[PDB]
């Protein structure tokens, strides 16, 4: 499905906020693609499960909350820390008596940094289609 920008604010770098334009393919553990940008350089990462899906199978997969954890992890909440140099996005999960890690998003970078920005401009167009003109219709 189309790469939709889910803007996220890093606790390490809240000034230039990131944009987890995550094109999740029907799941977050058996095939998904995340294109992360800070609005300046686009780490369009056609990511696979060879980098995150093992996070499930290596660190006590219990029986409480995982889908919601990763779902809220792709929006603006944990210590979102995307490494600009390594194109790798990580954050720490906090809860009772133990603070696990959740995401090891190694979000690759394409040569075009304006891809997510131009997509965000198509987004300014439809978001722009979000109040007054079809206000005028209805």
């Amino acid at each position: 499905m189309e790469r939709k920008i889910s803007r996220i604010h890093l606790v390490s770098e809240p000034s230039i906020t990131h944009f987890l334009q995550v094109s999740w393919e029907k799941t977050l553990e058996s095939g998904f693609v995340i294109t992360l940008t800070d609005g300046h350089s686009a780490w369009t990462g056609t990511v696979s499960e060879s980098e995150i899906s093992q996070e499930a199978d290596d660190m006590a997969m219990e029986k409480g909350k995982y889908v919601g954890e990763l779902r809220k992890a792709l929006l603006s909440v944990y210590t979102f820390n995307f490494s600009k140099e390594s194109c790798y996005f990580f954050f720490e999960k906090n809860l009772k008596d133990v603070s696990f890690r959740l995401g090891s998003f190694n979000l690759e970078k394409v040569e075009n940094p304006a891809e997510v920005i131009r997509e965000l401009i198509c987004y300014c167009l439809d978001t722009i289609a979000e109040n007054q003109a079809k206000n005028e219709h209805l």
Binding site: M59, A60, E62, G64, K65, Y66, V67, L95, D97, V98
Partner: protein, 218 residues
């Protein structure tokens, strides 16, 4: 001496977090571990493991447990009063081994911990589930005799004050004289058998918990 098992013994017979019939699982978490005596009155479990040995014992009993060892002490210490240790749990009094796991499936990452109660040696079985049970039987009968000396004239006073002045007007609530010797046969075989529902020693915990607090020394 031996404040861990002594605290276990002085800990009232308490209901551990269970989803089935209540067992004699009076957990007493100490500052240096715990002595856990779980009993269904069909088998004896004596989990007297300190907070240090239990950490390595979980590595050989728990299927997958990678948790901080320091956090284990804090996780256990809240169960000093047998009310909560982590939702609720359930002792497994189905076979020779008892399990305290509640299983769901969401691939999540909460904090989960379980108690693994090993088999108790016959010496411990005697010292915790026959000798103490005999002790509470003696205590209950000592409670019963001072009642019996108080059960022969007080139960007749109501009948003595029944018609002697202010004759009864509510005849629907009349009662018969009561005595300990009469109760030995007037109720044991007439109405008791219909209400005699015992099972595998189930009637133990509803009246031997508040009393079991006064065994602090032994």
């Amino acid at each position: 001496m031996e404040e861990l098992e002594q605290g276990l013994l002085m800990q009232p017979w308490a209901w551990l977090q269970l989803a089935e019939n209540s067992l004699l699982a009076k957990v007493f978490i100490t500052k240096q571990g715990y002595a856990l005596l779980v009993s269904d009155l069909q088998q004896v479990w004596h989990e007297q493991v300190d907070t240090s040995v239990v950490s390595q014992r979980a590595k050989e009993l728990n299927k997958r447990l990678t948790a901080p060892p320091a956090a284990f002490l804090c996780h256990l210490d809240n169960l000093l009063r047998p009310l909560l240790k982590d939702a609720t749990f359930s002792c497994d009094c189905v076979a020779d081994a008892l399990i305290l796991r509640v299983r769901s499936e969401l691939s999540g990452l909460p904090f989960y911990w379980n108690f693994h109660c090993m088999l108790a040696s016959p010496s411990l079985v005697s010292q915790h589930l026959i000798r103490p049970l005999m002790g509470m039987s003696l205590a209950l009968q000592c409670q019963v005799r001072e009642l019996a000396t108080l059960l022969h004239m007080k139960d007749l006073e109501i009948q003595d004050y029944q018609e002697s002045g202010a004759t009864l007007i509510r005849d629907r609530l009349k009662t018969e004289p009561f005595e300990e010797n009469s109760f030995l046969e007037q109720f044991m075989i007439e109405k008791l058998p219909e209400a005699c529902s015992i099972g595998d020693g189930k009637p133990f915990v509803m009246n031997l918990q508040d009393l079991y607090m006064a065994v602090t020394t032994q």
